[PDB]
Symmetry: none
Subunit: 221 residues, 2 copies
């Protein structure tokens, strides 16, 4: 973000590797939970547009999500420009040229320009504005794809049961829960959360069906 | 069902009080288990439509289930009639008027007519047909509502939270579950299953909210 020299200039300080590592951990662990959004906001405090793009490049491997963010950003940038039409006239010595949508997204603007806008009196808060666009994007992402908590791990209508089992157990293993809670998860929730067609098959098995028997029973359902 | 006189007539014999008592015991004990359906079928062997209605009157106190059976029966009866349109012409001396949907459900038909249909050569098996409709109904009932369980204990949109807590804990105490599963029930499911307005309040409490604090927080929600 932004820090002041002993010589009085507002200069840029890159986001700490520890803040960055935390953000990447949040995304890794909190898949697409509503919980990501508040964390993103906390971690991106004070960020310039350059910093925000730095955070996003760190979780860019999520290509379908990055695509969703791109479209949101392009949309909001386009509306910004509609509300803030380009003005060709000269800039008075005590004015500052307003940012365009692409300046806010960091695409057509420099760090120096971002800092000049952010620390103006009053600010042109391009870090906060870009952050709002990203948050709009993140909300659209979570709303389109649901969280992944144990309880919300549900077999898809066409998901091979072996794949569902894997997801289920992976999610299970990463949780911090007591063994009695985990025992309920394996013995009842797994069937509880199977799709309609597999559940019906699973529920018609015997008293002591083994997981391997379950997989055999639901193969190609 | 149906039995033959020494004089050769097929006459009606009421269902034995012991068969009836067994069926009522099955329903009492096997709440809404898939197990009810095979039992119902075994116990209703040979039943005329009158007999089937006799069995249902015996477990009629289950009003939400009886309502579900009514709707299924009305639906199937309506399709029967579509497949079996009324024919106004005279009936030949060696023919028998076909049953309507309501005749099969026993509503517009007499025991004598039911027996006449059932023992025709070949039969018009109105007992078996009505039994299939009832079974369609029972399957819909089990599939819709689980047998008494903690997971489907949900606070009503206008239910005082103290009443929900009572129901929840009563259900909890009667279960045979491990302590770690019950700990998850009290610490997370109770909030999980609160209504939309109470959950939002509960989720905005601190790290260590006591149940008494929860009740205070959700009072009149």
């Amino acid at each position: 973000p932004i820090v002041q020299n002993l010589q009085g200039q507002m200069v840029h300080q890159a986001i700490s590797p520890r803040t960055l590592n935390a953000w990447v951990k949040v995304v890794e662990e909190k898949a697409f939970s509503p919980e990501v959004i508040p964390m993103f906001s906390a971690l991106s405090e004070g960020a310039t547009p350059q910093d925000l793009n730095t955070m996003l490049n760190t979780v860019g491997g999520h290509q379908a999500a990055m695509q969703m963010l791109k479209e949101t950003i392009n949309e909001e940038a386009a509306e910004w420009d509609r509300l803030h039409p380009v003005h060709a006239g000269p800039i008075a010595p005590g004015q500052m040229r307003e940012p365009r949508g692409s300046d806010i997204a960091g695409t057509t603007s420099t760090l120096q320009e971002q800092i000049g806008w952010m620390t103006h009196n009053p600010p042109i808060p391009v870090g906060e504005i870009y952050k709002r666009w990203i948050i709009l994007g993140l909300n659209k992402i979570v709303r389109m794809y649901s969280p992944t908590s144990i309880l919300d791990i549900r077999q898809g209508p066409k998901e091979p049961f072996r794949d569902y089992v894997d997801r289920f157990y992976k999610t299970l293993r990463a949780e911090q829960a007591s063994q009695e809670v985990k025992n309920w998860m394996t013995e009842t929730l797994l069937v509880q959360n199977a799709n309609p067609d597999c559940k019906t098959i699973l529920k018609a098995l015997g008293p002591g069906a083994t997981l391997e028997e379950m997989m055999t029973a639901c193969q190609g359902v």
